[PDB]
Amino acid sequence: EPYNEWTLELLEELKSEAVRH
């Protein structure tokens, strides 16, 4: 489950955007 840390941290950038808007 190496991708899990890649996608999770990847969405962390989407949450900031959602949190940004």
Detailed description of the structure:
The protein is an all-alpha fold. Helices cover 90% and strands 0% of the residues. The chain is built from one helix and no strands. The longest helix has 19 residues. This is Protein Vpr. It is found in: Virion; Host nucleus; Host extracellular space. Belongs to the HIV-1 VPR protein family. It comes from Human immunodeficiency virus type 1 group M subtype B (isolate RF/HAT3).
What is this entry, summarized?
The protein is an all-alpha fold and 21 residues long.
SSE layout:
Layout: H1 2-20
Organism: Human immunodeficiency virus type 1 group M subtype B (isolate RF/HAT3)
Subcellular location: Virion; Host nucleus; Host extracellular space
Protein name: Protein Vpr
Report the β-strand fraction as a percent range: under 5%
Element order, helices and strands?
H
* Cα distance spanning the termini: 31 Å
User: What would you call the structural class?
Assistant: mainly alpha
**What's the shape?**
rod-shaped
**Main beta sheet:** none
What would you report as the Rg, rounded to the nearest angstrom?
9 Å
Proportion of residues in helical segments: over 70%
DSSP strand tally: 0
Compute the number of helices.
1
